[PDB]
Write an enzyme that holds these catalytic residues in place. Structure first.
Site, PDB file in Angstrom:
ATOM      1  N   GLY A  76      -9.326  29.042  36.563  1.00  0.00           N
ATOM      2  CA  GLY A  76      -8.448  27.728  37.110  1.00  0.00           C
ATOM      3  C   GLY A  76      -9.169  26.968  37.317  1.00  0.00           C
ATOM      4  N   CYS A  77      -8.995  25.762  37.687  1.00  0.00           N
ATOM      5  CA  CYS A  77      -9.771  24.709  37.995  1.00  0.00           C
ATOM      6  C   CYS A  77      -9.875  24.657  39.483  1.00  0.00           C
ATOM      7  CB  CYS A  77      -8.994  23.702  36.876  1.00  0.00           C
ATOM      8  SG  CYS A  77      -9.202  23.570  35.777  1.00  0.00           S
ATOM      9  N   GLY A  78     -11.305  25.262  39.972  1.00  0.00           N
ATOM     10  CA  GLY A  78     -11.671  24.636  41.250  1.00  0.00           C
ATOM     11  C   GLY A  78     -11.090  26.369  41.905  1.00  0.00           C
TER      12      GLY A  78
END
EC number: 3.4.22.49
Lengths: 1018, 74
Positions: A927-929
Site C-alpha cells: 500500500g502507500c504508507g
C-alpha cells in the site's frame, strides 16, 4: 420552623424542575441535530469531530442556552438560604423531615448534573446527615473519595450505619483510604482491593448497587499504582491504571442505560431520548431518586473524563481520540454547560498536545469552538453567572483562556494568580462540607488536574523555545508545584511530570558541541541527579508519557557511564505501544513491561545474538537526536547527532520532496507517459543526492558507525584496551572496542574525526592527538589477521518516515532491516527463544495466506498479483474481506501473510482482530504508507498500524513508507518473493529488487522491514 | 524509454484518520433491578405546572454574582 422551609422546598423544586425542564429542551434540540448531522443510527469516527464542532455551535446559539443562567444563580441562592436554615431542618426531629428530605435532594440533582461538584457533595452529605438514606450514602461515599478528602471520610465512616449491602462497599473505601495514608499498609490493603476487584466481577448478579460499586472499586484500584515502589512493593504487582479505568467507565456506563438510556457513552443509537424530565414513569415527588439519577449521571461523566484524561497522559493516541469524542457527544446529549466545556477544551487541549498528525485543522476547528462556546452571540452574561459560583468551571474558563492564547507565559501568570482567587472564592462550599473551621480544604481535584494540565503544557513550550531566564518563571513554577502536591496519589501524572519539566528548566544541558550546528554549579548538578537516580529506581512501573519521555531521555543525556544511558534511552520510547501490552496483561509490575534497572537490562543485551546489533536513534527530552548503538560485546555507544532544528530542516525538505511524489501520483491530470517518469526521475535523482547530503550534513562522520558490529578478535582486543588506556579517559572501552572494529571500513580522516568526536565530550587530550593516526595503521594490521550480521534501526518516529536503511554506507551493505522498539525486540527475541526458532525465520511460503484487493476497486493490480499466485498454491480470498474469524485463523495457522490491498488493516484486519489472536505469521503489507508513522509529538511514538502488530507479536512486517505507484510496488513484490526461492534472505531480496526497480530511492526505498529477518525454508 | 503511467493504491484510512468505532465499549443486554432499601411513600399536593413553575422563579432574581459573597458570612 416549617413556615419558611415549606416555602423553600416549593422554591427549590420549582427551580430544579424549572431547570430540569429547561435543559430537557436543550437536549431535545440537539436531538434534532444528531439525526441531521450523524443519523438515527449513524457511524461516528475521528472525522466525526468536525461534525461535533457544528452541534456545539448550534447548542450555544440556541435560544435556551442563555436561559439556564437564571436557573444557575437561583439554585445558588437556594443553597445559601438552605445552609442558613439547615440548623432548623435538623432540629425538626419528626417524620416531616421526610418531606424535608427533598430540599437538598432536588439540589443534589442540580449540582451533580451541572457538575458543580464541590457544591454537589455537600448538599448530598447534608442529605445523608438529614435523611440517612441507604442508597444515597452509597453515592456520598464515592464522591468524598473522588475529591480526595482523606480527613473527611474518617469522621463520617464511623457515624453511619453499614448494613449487609453497605459493609461490602464501605470496606472498599476503607482499604483505599488506609492505602494512601500509611506507607506500611500499601502491601496489605492492595491485596484487599485485588481480592475485592475480582470479588465483584465474579458475582453474576445484576443489582444496581452492585454495579454502583463495580465501577467504583475499579476506580479505586485504577489510581492504585501511583505510589513510589520500594523494597516491599517490588515483589507485589499493581493493577494498571489504563486497563480498568476503561472498565470503570464501562460499569458506570451500564449504570446509565438502566436509568436514562441516552446518556450512555456506548449508546451510538441516538434515537433514544436522553431526556431526564419524565424520570422513569414517576419519581416526580420521590426524594431519593434525584440523588440516584443525579450522582450516577455525574459519575459517568467523572469517569469518561477520567478515561479521557488518563489517555492523554499514557500516550494511548488511539484510545484517547475515540474516548475524547464520545465523551463530548454524551455531554452534548446531556446539554450541561459545564460537562460540554470540560470536554470541549480537552479536545482543543489534546490537539495542542499531539502535533503534525493532520491535526492542525483539528485544533483550529476546536480551539475556536470552545471560545465559540464561551463568548456571547456564537457563530459575560451567561458565562460570568456560573464563573464565580462554580469552582471547577472557573478553572475551565481560564483553561480555555490558555488554549485560546496557546499557553503563553503571561497567560499562566494570568492563571497562577486567578487560581488563588478561585480557591479562596470557592473555599466556602468546601468548608461547609467539613463542618469545621479548623481544617483547611485542598483545591477541587478537577481544578488541580486542570492546573496540572495547563502548566505542564506551558513548560514544554518553555523547553521547546529553550529559556529559563526570568525569576517569575520560578515563582510561577514554585507555586505550580505546591498546587499539584495536595494528593501524592491519584494525580501523579501531573506531579512527576512538572518536577522533571521544572528540573530540566533549571538544568537544560544543551551541550553545544562542534558537530551539532543548530540552524535557524556541579553541586547543583548532583543535587538533582541523586533524585533522578531514585526517581528512576522508584516509579519504574509508571509509563506516563510526559514524565517518562522527559526523565529517561534526560538521564540518558547526562549520565557518565554508558550502561545507565542505554537503559534510560530504551525505556524512554514507545509509551503508547507498551501500555496496550500493559492493559493486555491487565496487571502492571516493576519488571514485566519495563526492565528492572540496569542489571537486568544488560543481561538481555548480552543475550542478544552476536550478529544482531541495534542502532537506536532517539530524541532526547530537550529535542536533540542522540544515537544509541547497542551490542553484546561492546558497551553501548551514545553520541549526539544534531538538534531538532537540523532534523526539522531534514524532515521539512524530505516531505516537501515526498509531496512531489504524492502530487504526481494523486494528480497526474493529462501528462504524457514519458514526462510522467522523466520529471520525478530527477526528484528520485535528488534523493540520490539527498541521502548523500544527509550522510554529510546531518549524521556527518557518525554515519559510518551505523554499520553492524561483530565480535572483536582477542588478538585485536588487546589494541582496543590500549586505545582506551592511551586515551587518558577520553574514550571508554566499549566505545573504543568498536572504533578499532569499524576502522577498516571508514576513511583515515573520518576515523581520526570520530574518535576525536568522542573526546569532545569527555576531556580531550593534546598528546593523544599527535599519536592519533598511528592507532589507525595499527588497527588495520590487527583486523585483517583476526555471517550475515544486521544493523537494526529503532528510529524515533519524528524521523521514521525517512528511509534510514538506504544510505551511502549501505549501498554495498544490504542487511539493514529496521525495528520498532528495543524492548519490543527483546520480547520478539525471547519469543524466538521460547519457540526455539532460528534467528532468521524459515518460512514455507507455499501455504501462506493472502489478502488481495478487497471490495474489487483496485483494478488490474488485482489481476496482476493473482498471476503470481497462480504460480504458487496460496490460500485466501479475492475482492473481499472474508471474516475476522478467518483472519485470526490466518495469522495463527498460516506461516506468512500477504497484503496487496488498499492501505494496511483498514477493513480486512482492524485493531479488533489483532488483539484477540497472536501472530507467528510474517506479514507483508503493501500500500502507500503501510508502515508510515505519522510523526506525533514527543513521547506518543507516532500514529500508525505497526503498534498493533508490535502488540500482537508478529515476527516481521514488510511495509511501505509513502505513497507509491501501485504498479511498481507490485513489480516489487513479484521480484522479491521470487528472489527468496529462485541463502538469499529478505533484506538481500529487497536490495536485489532495487536493482530491478525503475526508480532508485523514490520507489525502492519505500519498503522497509520491521522484524527478525526472513530466510526461505528449504 | 519508460513504462506507461501508473495509478497508486492509496489508503482511505490514512492510518487512523478515520476509525468507525463499534458500539461494544460495554456489555450488551444489561437491564438491571434497583435493589433499593428506602422506598417510602411520598406526599400529594397541588403541583406547580410548567406555567406555574416560572411564576415562582420570576420572584427570585437571586443576586448578581454576589451569592458567593454571602456564602462565607454564615
Amino acid at each position: 420552623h416549617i413556615e419558611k422551609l415549606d416555602e423553600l422546598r416549593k422554591n427549590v423544586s420549582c427551580t430544579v424542575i424549572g431547570f430540569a425542564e429547561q435543559t430537557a429542551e436543550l437536549q431535545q434540540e440537539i436531538s434534532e441535530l444528531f439525526i441531521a448531522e450523524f443519523g438515527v443510527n449513524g457511524p461516528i469516527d475521528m472525522n466525526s469531530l468536525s461534525k461535533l464542532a457544528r452541534i456545539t455551535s448550534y447548542y450555544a446559539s440556541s435560544e435556551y442556552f442563555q436561559g439556564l443562567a437564571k436557573y444557575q444563580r437561583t439554585a445558588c441562592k437556594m443553597f445559601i438560604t438552605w445552609q442558613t436554615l439547615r440548623k432548623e431542618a435538623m432540629e425538626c426531629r419528626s417524620k416531616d423531615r421526610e418531606i424535608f428530605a427533598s430540599i437538598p435532594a432536588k439540589l443534589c440533582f442540580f449540582y451533580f448534573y451541572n457538575g458543580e461538584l464541590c457544591r454537589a457533595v455537600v448538599c448530598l452529605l447534608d442529605y445523608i446527615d438529614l435523611s440517612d438514606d441507604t442508597l444515597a450514602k452509597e453515592a456520598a461515599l464515592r464522591w468524598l473519595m473522588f475529591l480526595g478528602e482523606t480527613e473527611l471520610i474518617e469522621k463520617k465512616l464511623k457515624t453511619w450505619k453499614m448494613d449487609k449491602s453497605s459493609k461490602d462497599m464501605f470496606s472498599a473505601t476503607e482499604f483505599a483510604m488506609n492505602y494512601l495514608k500509611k506507607s506500611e499498609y500499601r502491601v496489605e490493603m492492595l491485596e484487599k482491593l485485588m481480592k475485592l476487584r475480582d470479588k465483584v466481577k465474579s458475582d453474576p448478579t445484576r443489582s444496581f448497587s452492585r454495579y454502583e460499586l463495580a465501577s467504583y472499586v475499579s476506580w479505586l484500584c485504577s489510581t492504585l499504582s501511583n505510589v513510589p515502589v520500594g523494597s516491599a512493593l517490588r515483589e507485589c504487582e499493581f493493577p494498571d491504571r489504563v486497563s480498568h479505568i476503561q472498565e470503570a467507565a464501562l460499569k458506570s456506563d451500564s449504570l446509565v442505560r438502566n436509568r436514562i438510556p441516552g446518556l450512555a457513552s456506548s449508546q451510538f443509537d441516538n434515537s433514544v431520548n436522553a431526556s431526564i424530565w419524565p424520570f422513569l414513569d414517576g419519581h416526580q415527588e420521590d426524594s431519593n431518586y434525584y440523588v440516584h439519577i443525579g450522582s450516577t449521571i455525574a459519575w459517568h461523566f467523572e469517569m469518561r473524563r477520567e478515561c479521557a484524561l488518563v489517555n492523554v497522559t499514557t500516550a494511548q493516541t488511539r484510545d484517547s481520540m475515540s474516548a475524547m469524542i464520545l465523551n463530548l457527544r454524551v455531554a452534548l446529549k446531556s446539554a450541561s454547560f459545564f460537562r460540554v466545556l470540560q470536554t470541549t477544551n480537552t479536545l482543543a487541549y489534546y490537539s495542542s498536545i499531539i502535533e503534525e498528525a493532520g491535526s492542525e485543522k483539528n485544533a483550529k476547528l476546536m480551539r475556536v469552538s470552545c471560545v465559540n462556546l464561551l463568548s456571547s452571540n456564537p457563530i459575560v452574561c451567561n458565562v460570568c453567572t456560573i464563573y464565580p459560583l462554580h469552582s471547577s468551571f472557573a478553572a475551565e474558563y481560564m483553561m480555555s483562556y490558555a488554549i485560546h492564547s496557546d499557553f503563553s507565559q503571561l497567560s499562566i501568570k494570568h492563571f497562577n494568580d486567578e487560581f488563588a482567587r478561585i480557591r479562596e472564592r470557592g473555599m466556602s462550599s468546601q468548608v461547609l462540607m467539613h463542618r469545621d473551621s479548623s481544617v483547611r480544604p485542598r483545591p477541587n481535584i478537577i481544578q488541580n488536574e486542570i492546573f496540572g494540565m495547563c502548566v505542564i503544557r506551558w513548560l514544554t513550550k518553555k523547553l521547546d523555545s529553550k529559556e529559563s531566564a526570568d525569576e517569575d518563571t520560578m515563582e510561577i513554577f514554585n507555586n505550580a508545584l505546591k498546587i499539584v502536591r495536595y494528593l501524592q496519589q491519584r494525580t501523579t501524572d501531573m506531579i512527576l511530570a512538572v518536577t522533571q519539566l521544572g528540573r530540566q528548566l533549571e538544568f537544560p544541558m544543551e551541550c553545544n558541541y562542534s558537530w551539532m550546528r543548530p540552524t535557524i554549579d556541579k553541586e547543583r548538578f548532583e543535587k538533582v541527579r541523586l533524585a533522578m537516580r531514585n526517581e528512576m529506581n522508584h516509579y519504574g512501573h509508571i509509563l506516563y508519557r510526559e514524565w517518562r519521555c522527559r526523565l529517561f531521555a534526560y538521564v540518558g543525556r547526562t549520565s557518565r557511564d554508558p550502561w545507565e544511558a542505554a537503559y534510560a534511552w530504551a525505556e524512554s520510547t514507545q509509551i503508547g505501544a507498551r501500555n496496550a501490552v500493559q492493559s493486555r496483561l491487565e496487571k502492571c509490575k516493576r519488571g514485566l513491561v519495563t526492565m528492572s534497572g540496569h542489571d537486568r537490562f544488560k543481561t538481555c543485551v548480552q543475550s542478544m545474538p552476536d550478529e544482531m546489533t541495534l542502532v537506536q536513534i532517539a530524541m532526547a527530552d530537550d529535542k536533540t537526536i542522540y544515537l544509541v548503538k547497542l551490542h553484546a560485546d561492546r558497551d553501548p555507544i551514545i553520541m549526539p547527532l544534531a538538534h531538532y532544528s537540523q532534523a526539522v530542516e531534514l524532515m521539512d525538505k524530505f516531505t516537501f520532496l515526498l509531496d512531489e511524489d504524492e502530487m504526481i501520483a494523486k494528480y497526474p491530470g493529462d501528462i504524457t507517459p514519458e514526462e510522467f517518469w522523466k520529471r520525478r526521475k530527477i526528484v528520485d535523482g535528488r534523493m540520490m543526492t539527498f541521502v548523500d547530503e544527509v550522510q554529510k550534513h546531518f549524521l556527518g562522520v557518525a554515519a559510518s558507525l551505523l554499520m553492524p558490529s561483530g565480535q572483536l578478535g582477542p588478538k585485536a582486543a588487546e589494541l582496543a584496551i590500549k586505545i582506551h588506556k592511551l586515551s587518558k579517559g577520553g574514550l571508554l572501552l566499549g566505545e573504543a572496542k568498536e572504533m578499532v572494529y569499524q576502522s577498516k571500513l571508514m576513511d583515515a580522516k573520518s576515523w581520526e574525526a570520530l574518535i576525536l568526536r568522542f573526546c569532545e565530550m569527555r576531556t580531550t587530550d593534546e598528546k593523544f592527538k599527535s599519536f592519533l593516526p598511528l592507532m589507525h595503521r595499527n588497527s588495520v594490521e590487527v583486523m585483517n589477521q583476526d555471517e550475515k550480521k544486521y544493523t537494526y534501526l529503532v528510529i524515533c518516529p519524528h524521523l521514521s518516515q525517512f528511509c534510514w536503511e538506504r544510505l551511502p554506507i549501505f549501498d554495498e551493505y544490504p542487511y539493514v532491516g529496521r525495528q520498532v522498539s528495543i524492548h519490543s525486540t527483546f520480547s520478539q527475541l525471547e519469543a524466538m527463544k521460547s519457540q526455539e526458532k532460528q534467528i532468521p525465520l524459515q518460512i514455507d511460503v507455499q501455504n501462506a495466506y493472502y489478502i488481495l484487493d478487497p471490495d474489487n476497486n483496485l483494478g488490474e493490480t488485482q489481476k496482476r498479483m493473482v498471476e503470481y499466485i497462480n504460480k504458487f498454491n496460496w490460500e485466501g480470498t479475492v475482492g473481499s474481506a472474508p471474516k475476522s474469524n478467518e483472519i485470526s485463523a490466518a495469522l495463527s495457522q498460516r506461516d506468512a501473510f500477504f497484503f496487496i490491498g488498499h492501505g494496511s488493516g483498514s477493513s480486512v484486519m482492524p485493531r479488533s482482530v489483532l488483539k484477540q489472536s497472536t501472530c507467528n505469521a510474517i506479514s507483508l503489507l503493501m500500500g502507500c504508507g503501510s508502515v508510515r508513522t505519522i510523526p506525533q509529538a514527543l513521547g506518543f511514538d507516532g500514529k500508525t498500524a505497526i503498534l498493533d502488530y508490535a502488540m500482537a507479536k508478529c515476527p516481521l512486517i514488510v511495509g511501505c513508507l509513502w505513497t507509491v505507484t501501485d504498479g511498481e510496488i507490485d513489480r516489487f513484490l513479484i521480484r522479491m518473493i521470487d528472489d527468496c526461492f529462485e541463502l538469499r534472505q529478505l533484506s538481500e531480496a529487497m536490495h536485489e529488487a532495487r536493482s530491478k526497480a525503475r526508480l532508485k530511492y523514490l520507489t525502492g526505498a519505500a519498503v522497509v522491514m520491521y522484524g527478525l529477518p526472513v530466510v526461505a525454508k528449504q | 524509454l519508460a513504462a506507461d503511467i501508473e495509478d497508486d493504491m492509496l489508503n482511505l484510512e490514512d492510518q487512523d484518520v478515520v476509525l468507525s468505532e463499534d458500539r461494544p465499549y460495554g456489555d450488551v443486554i444489561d437491564p438491571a433491578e434497583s435493589e433499593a432499601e428506602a422506598l417510602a411513600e411520598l406526599g400529594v399536593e397541588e403541583w406547580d405546572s410548567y406555567p406555574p413553575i416560572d411564576p415562582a422563579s420570576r420572584i427570585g432574581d437571586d443576586f448578581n454574582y454576589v451569592l458567593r459573597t454571602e456564602d462565607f458570612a454564615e
